[PDB]
Amino acid sequence: ACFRMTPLYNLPTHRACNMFLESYKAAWILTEDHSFEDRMIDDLSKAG
Amino acid sequence: MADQLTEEQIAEFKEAFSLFDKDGDGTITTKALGTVMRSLGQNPTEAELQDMINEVNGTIDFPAFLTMMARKMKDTDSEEEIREAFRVFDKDGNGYISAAALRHVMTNLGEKLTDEEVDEMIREAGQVNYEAFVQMMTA
Amino acid sequence: SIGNIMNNKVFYQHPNLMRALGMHETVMEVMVNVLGGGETKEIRFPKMVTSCCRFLCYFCRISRQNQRSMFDHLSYLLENSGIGLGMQGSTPLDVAA
Amino acid sequence: KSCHLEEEEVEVSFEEKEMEKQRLLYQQSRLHTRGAAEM
Amino acid sequence: HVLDVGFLPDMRAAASLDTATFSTTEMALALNRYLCLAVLPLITKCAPLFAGTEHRAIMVDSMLHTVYRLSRGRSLTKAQRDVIEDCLMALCRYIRPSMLQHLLRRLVFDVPILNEFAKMPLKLLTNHYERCWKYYCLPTGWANF
Amino acid sequence: FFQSIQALMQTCSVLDLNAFERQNKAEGLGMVNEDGTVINRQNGEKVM
Amino acid sequence: SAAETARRTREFRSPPQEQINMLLHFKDEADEEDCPLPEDIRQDLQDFH
């Protein structure tokens, strides 16, 4: 099978977009926002 | 499975089936399925259409038709995919391939196969054509 | 309603939709409510389990990921499968197989 | 994560290491006086 | 085992003519003839195989009468490989074909014994000449061929 | 509360050996016919 | 150069989803880049993202 797999340039446009989003879970899952953690308990709770 | 067929030919089959829909419910009988199936190009004998009802009453629906069409195209697709997938392996495409060339190209098909596996694979067998590779891997 | 679902030309081309909408999840509770009963005498509303369990089997034979997604409920399915036996066409045991 | 934030390397001096165990002691101090712990 | 399994095989074309309703016997030819076509172990001191040899040919008599293009290959490969095991004493089996095999030399049933006949000559190009009528039958077929 | 702690830790798993064999042949395959290869990849949920 | 054929393997081998991973990895990555794209389409991501 692996020898008969299809090139990328024959895929329909609609299908070649869903694979992009599912595969592009490589810029959110690794990026870190931090932010809400130390500023959370600071503005909330304390000084409330 | 029913995942070996692209969407366009599924659409073509749906159009062919709907064009001769009985009353919109998709219930058709044995005589008419041969007519609708010979309408879009494929014209085989009467034996296969005799066994189709045997695999699945006089009540034929679209899912059963799609499944039987799918698995009568899939065997041909699988039997033919073993010849086109080899075209990239040889430069000219005829079948002759040097044994030295595969030492650095047959380890990078994306299967994460390192040198040891291909050592054992090619050692267990000059230039080798495609049919010997068929016997080599299909076993 | 289910009979019109299996003719729309779209529940054959994009299986990834139907796991995202997850109608297989919703239809599953439909079966458990009617079959929920003390004993075999609680077989009220037959002819609908057979009419719906047929749809589940064909869903399971469209893609490998479709097979996995419904497989995880195997323990759930067998819990309420080997009681209501005696009808034809289909039974929850068949889709379990 | 609001507490354990501060929870091949030179030796740590005496004065600095109390700052961590005092900051940690205070960071969770607000989080046990204010109900919490008994939940 | 063939003195009990062939008893059912004896009813091969016992219905393959008129209509034959329940063709469930053909379903038994998907797990019995396939098992027999997997043993090249053959000896002598018997002639019951001769009754079984024609029986397979009797089952292959139907060129389309309830055979299925896929299920027909099982019975076709059941005898095509059953030749390379006999003690070169295939007597009446050749006479069963004779000129009947030569007859209908324009049908699809030709390749049924055409390639099978070539397997006999390609395994006896230095022997199998210790006969008489068969030697005459060969020329009788050769001239009519 | 002590009912929970006592019951909970009795459901903890140990190093099973039968489940190990199930990995050792499942890892033999490398990719589906054509579906994004083995999506689970590691699929560590088994031994522990 | 012969071995260049070994380098060009994603382009015909591997399933289509695998190709996307290779060509998209370096785009929104940091520092190290392998098998990169032209440095003209790798700027809108650093603006869009």
Side-chain angles (χ1 to χ4, degrees), chain C residues 5-33:
Chain C
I5 301 299
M6 293 177 71
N7 209 8
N8 296 115
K9 186 204 160 297
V10 176
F11 174 42
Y12 294 111
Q13 293 167 171
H14 300 139
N16 269 18
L17 290 183
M18 313 302 309
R19 292 183 291 113
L21 279 77
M23 84 197 158
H24 63 87
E25 281 305 0
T26 55
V27 66
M28 261 295 318
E29 293 83 4
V30 179
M31 198 161 65
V32 75
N33 310 293

Short mmCIF file of all heavy atoms in Angstrom, two decimals, chain C residues 5-33:
data_model
loop_
_atom_site.label_atom_id
_atom_site.label_comp_id
_atom_site.label_asym_id
_atom_site.label_seq_id
_atom_site.Cartn_x
_atom_site.Cartn_y
_atom_site.Cartn_z
N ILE C 5 -32.49 9.49 6.76
CA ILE C 5 -31.07 9.77 7.01
C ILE C 5 -30.20 8.97 6.06
O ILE C 5 -29.23 9.49 5.49
CB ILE C 5 -30.70 9.49 8.48
CG1 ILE C 5 -31.54 10.35 9.42
CG2 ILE C 5 -29.22 9.76 8.71
CD1 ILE C 5 -31.35 11.83 9.23
N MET C 6 -30.52 7.69 5.86
CA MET C 6 -29.66 6.83 5.04
C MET C 6 -30.02 6.93 3.57
O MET C 6 -30.12 5.93 2.86
CB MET C 6 -29.79 5.39 5.53
CG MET C 6 -29.23 5.15 6.92
SD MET C 6 -29.50 3.45 7.46
CE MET C 6 -28.35 2.59 6.40
N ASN C 7 -30.23 8.16 3.09
CA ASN C 7 -30.35 8.38 1.65
C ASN C 7 -29.81 9.73 1.21
O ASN C 7 -30.05 10.12 0.06
CB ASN C 7 -31.82 8.23 1.22
CG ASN C 7 -31.96 7.76 -0.21
OD1 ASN C 7 -30.98 7.39 -0.85
ND2 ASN C 7 -33.19 7.76 -0.71
N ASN C 8 -29.10 10.47 2.06
CA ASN C 8 -28.86 11.89 1.81
C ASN C 8 -27.58 12.16 1.04
O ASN C 8 -27.24 13.34 0.86
CB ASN C 8 -28.82 12.66 3.14
CG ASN C 8 -30.14 12.63 3.87
OD1 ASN C 8 -30.24 12.06 4.96
ND2 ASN C 8 -31.16 13.24 3.28
N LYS C 9 -26.85 11.13 0.61
CA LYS C 9 -25.64 11.25 -0.19
C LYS C 9 -24.50 11.89 0.61
O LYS C 9 -23.36 11.93 0.12
CB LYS C 9 -25.89 12.05 -1.48
CG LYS C 9 -24.74 12.14 -2.46
CD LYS C 9 -24.89 13.38 -3.33
CE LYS C 9 -23.57 13.78 -3.95
NZ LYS C 9 -22.57 14.14 -2.91
N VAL C 10 -24.75 12.34 1.83
CA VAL C 10 -23.73 12.95 2.65
C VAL C 10 -23.28 12.04 3.79
O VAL C 10 -22.11 12.11 4.19
CB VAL C 10 -24.21 14.31 3.20
CG1 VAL C 10 -23.19 14.93 4.14
CG2 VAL C 10 -24.51 15.26 2.05
N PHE C 11 -24.14 11.15 4.28
CA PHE C 11 -23.70 10.13 5.21
C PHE C 11 -23.06 8.95 4.47
O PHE C 11 -23.31 7.78 4.76
CB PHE C 11 -24.90 9.69 6.05
CG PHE C 11 -24.65 8.53 6.98
CD1 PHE C 11 -23.48 8.45 7.72
CD2 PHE C 11 -25.60 7.54 7.13
CE1 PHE C 11 -23.26 7.38 8.57
CE2 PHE C 11 -25.39 6.48 7.98
CZ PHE C 11 -24.22 6.40 8.70
N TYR C 12 -22.24 9.27 3.47
CA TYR C 12 -21.31 8.32 2.86
C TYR C 12 -19.97 8.94 2.49
O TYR C 12 -18.99 8.20 2.36
CB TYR C 12 -21.93 7.70 1.61
CG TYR C 12 -23.13 6.82 1.92
CD1 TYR C 12 -24.41 7.21 1.54
CD2 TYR C 12 -22.98 5.62 2.60
CE1 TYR C 12 -25.50 6.42 1.83
CE2 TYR C 12 -24.06 4.82 2.89
CZ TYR C 12 -25.32 5.23 2.50
OH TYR C 12 -26.41 4.44 2.79
N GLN C 13 -19.89 10.26 2.32
CA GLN C 13 -18.69 10.93 1.84
C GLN C 13 -17.87 11.55 2.95
O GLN C 13 -16.64 11.62 2.83
CB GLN C 13 -19.06 12.02 0.83
CG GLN C 13 -19.65 11.52 -0.47
CD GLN C 13 -20.28 12.63 -1.28
OE1 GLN C 13 -20.65 12.44 -2.44
NE2 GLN C 13 -20.39 13.81 -0.68
N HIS C 14 -18.51 12.02 4.02
CA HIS C 14 -17.83 12.73 5.10
C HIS C 14 -18.19 12.09 6.44
O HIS C 14 -18.97 12.65 7.22
CB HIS C 14 -18.21 14.21 5.09
CG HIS C 14 -17.85 14.92 3.82
ND1 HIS C 14 -18.68 15.84 3.21
CD2 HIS C 14 -16.75 14.84 3.04
CE1 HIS C 14 -18.10 16.30 2.12
NE2 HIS C 14 -16.93 15.71 1.99
N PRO C 15 -17.64 10.91 6.73
CA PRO C 15 -17.89 10.30 8.04
C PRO C 15 -17.39 11.15 9.20
O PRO C 15 -17.95 11.05 10.30
CB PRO C 15 -17.13 8.97 7.95
CG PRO C 15 -16.95 8.71 6.49
CD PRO C 15 -16.78 10.07 5.88
N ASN C 16 -16.37 11.98 8.97
CA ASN C 16 -15.84 12.81 10.05
C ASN C 16 -16.90 13.77 10.60
O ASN C 16 -16.86 14.11 11.79
CB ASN C 16 -14.62 13.58 9.56
CG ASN C 16 -13.33 12.83 9.81
OD1 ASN C 16 -13.34 11.62 10.04
ND2 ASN C 16 -12.21 13.54 9.75
N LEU C 17 -17.84 14.21 9.76
CA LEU C 17 -18.96 14.99 10.26
C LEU C 17 -19.74 14.22 11.31
O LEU C 17 -20.03 14.73 12.40
CB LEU C 17 -19.90 15.39 9.12
CG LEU C 17 -19.42 16.41 8.10
CD1 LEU C 17 -20.53 16.70 7.12
CD2 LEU C 17 -19.08 17.65 8.86
N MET C 18 -20.11 12.98 10.99
CA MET C 18 -21.12 12.29 11.79
C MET C 18 -20.59 11.90 13.16
O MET C 18 -21.38 11.69 14.09
CB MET C 18 -21.65 11.09 11.02
CG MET C 18 -21.99 11.43 9.58
SD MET C 18 -23.22 12.75 9.39
CE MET C 18 -24.54 12.22 10.45
N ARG C 19 -19.27 11.78 13.32
CA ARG C 19 -18.69 11.67 14.65
C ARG C 19 -18.58 13.01 15.35
O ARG C 19 -18.51 13.05 16.59
CB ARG C 19 -17.31 11.02 14.59
CG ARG C 19 -17.31 9.56 14.18
CD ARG C 19 -15.90 8.97 14.22
NE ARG C 19 -15.06 9.55 13.18
CZ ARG C 19 -14.02 10.34 13.40
NH1 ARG C 19 -13.63 10.63 14.63
NH2 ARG C 19 -13.35 10.84 12.37
N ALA C 20 -18.54 14.11 14.60
CA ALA C 20 -18.51 15.42 15.23
C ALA C 20 -19.91 15.85 15.66
O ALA C 20 -20.08 16.44 16.73
CB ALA C 20 -17.90 16.45 14.29
N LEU C 21 -20.92 15.56 14.84
CA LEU C 21 -22.29 15.72 15.29
C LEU C 21 -22.66 14.62 16.28
O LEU C 21 -23.47 14.85 17.19
CB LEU C 21 -23.25 15.72 14.10
CG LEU C 21 -23.42 17.00 13.29
CD1 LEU C 21 -22.23 17.24 12.37
CD2 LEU C 21 -24.71 16.95 12.50
N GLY C 22 -22.08 13.44 16.11
CA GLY C 22 -22.26 12.37 17.08
C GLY C 22 -23.69 11.88 17.22
O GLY C 22 -24.16 11.72 18.35
N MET C 23 -24.39 11.65 16.11
CA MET C 23 -25.75 11.15 16.23
C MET C 23 -25.76 9.72 16.75
O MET C 23 -26.75 9.28 17.34
CB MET C 23 -26.50 11.22 14.91
CG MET C 23 -26.26 10.04 13.98
SD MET C 23 -26.75 10.37 12.29
CE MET C 23 -25.75 9.17 11.43
N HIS C 24 -24.67 8.97 16.54
CA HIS C 24 -24.59 7.62 17.08
C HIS C 24 -24.67 7.65 18.60
O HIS C 24 -25.23 6.73 19.21
CB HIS C 24 -23.30 6.94 16.62
CG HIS C 24 -22.06 7.62 17.10
ND1 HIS C 24 -21.48 7.34 18.32
CD2 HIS C 24 -21.28 8.56 16.52
CE1 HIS C 24 -20.40 8.08 18.47
NE2 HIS C 24 -20.25 8.83 17.39
N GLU C 25 -24.12 8.69 19.22
CA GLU C 25 -24.30 8.87 20.65
C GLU C 25 -25.77 9.03 21.00
O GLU C 25 -26.30 8.30 21.84
CB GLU C 25 -23.50 10.09 21.13
CG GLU C 25 -21.99 9.87 21.33
CD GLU C 25 -21.62 8.72 22.26
OE1 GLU C 25 -22.51 8.04 22.81
OE2 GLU C 25 -20.40 8.50 22.45
N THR C 26 -26.46 9.97 20.34
CA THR C 26 -27.84 10.29 20.70
C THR C 26 -28.77 9.11 20.45
O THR C 26 -29.64 8.81 21.29
CB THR C 26 -28.31 11.52 19.94
OG1 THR C 26 -28.14 11.30 18.53
CG2 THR C 26 -27.52 12.75 20.35
N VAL C 27 -28.63 8.44 19.31
CA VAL C 27 -29.51 7.32 19.00
C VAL C 27 -29.32 6.19 20.00
O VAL C 27 -30.23 5.37 20.21
CB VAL C 27 -29.28 6.84 17.55
CG1 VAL C 27 -27.90 6.25 17.40
CG2 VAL C 27 -30.34 5.83 17.14
N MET C 28 -28.16 6.12 20.65
CA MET C 28 -27.89 5.04 21.59
C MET C 28 -28.83 5.10 22.79
O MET C 28 -29.33 4.06 23.24
CB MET C 28 -26.43 5.09 22.04
CG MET C 28 -25.52 4.12 21.29
SD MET C 28 -25.92 2.38 21.58
CE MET C 28 -26.23 2.39 23.35
N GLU C 29 -29.08 6.29 23.33
CA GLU C 29 -30.00 6.39 24.46
C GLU C 29 -31.42 6.03 24.05
O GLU C 29 -32.21 5.58 24.89
CB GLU C 29 -29.99 7.78 25.10
CG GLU C 29 -28.71 8.17 25.79
CD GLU C 29 -27.68 8.71 24.83
OE1 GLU C 29 -28.03 8.84 23.64
OE2 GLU C 29 -26.55 9.01 25.26
N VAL C 30 -31.78 6.25 22.78
CA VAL C 30 -33.12 5.89 22.32
C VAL C 30 -33.37 4.41 22.54
O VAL C 30 -34.46 4.01 22.97
CB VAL C 30 -33.29 6.29 20.85
CG1 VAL C 30 -34.67 5.90 20.35
CG2 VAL C 30 -33.05 7.78 20.67
N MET C 31 -32.37 3.57 22.27
CA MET C 31 -32.53 2.14 22.46
C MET C 31 -32.59 1.77 23.94
O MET C 31 -33.36 0.89 24.34
CB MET C 31 -31.39 1.39 21.77
CG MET C 31 -31.68 -0.08 21.53
SD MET C 31 -30.60 -0.80 20.28
CE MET C 31 -29.00 -0.65 21.07
N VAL C 32 -31.79 2.43 24.78
CA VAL C 32 -31.70 2.01 26.18
C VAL C 32 -32.99 2.34 26.93
O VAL C 32 -33.36 1.61 27.87
CB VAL C 32 -30.47 2.63 26.87
CG1 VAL C 32 -30.68 4.10 27.17
CG2 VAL C 32 -30.14 1.87 28.14
N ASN C 33 -33.69 3.41 26.56
CA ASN C 33 -34.91 3.77 27.27
C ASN C 33 -36.01 2.74 27.03
O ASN C 33 -36.69 2.30 27.97
CB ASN C 33 -35.39 5.16 26.87
CG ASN C 33 -34.29 6.20 26.94
OD1 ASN C 33 -33.81 6.53 28.02
ND2 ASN C 33 -33.91 6.74 25.79
#
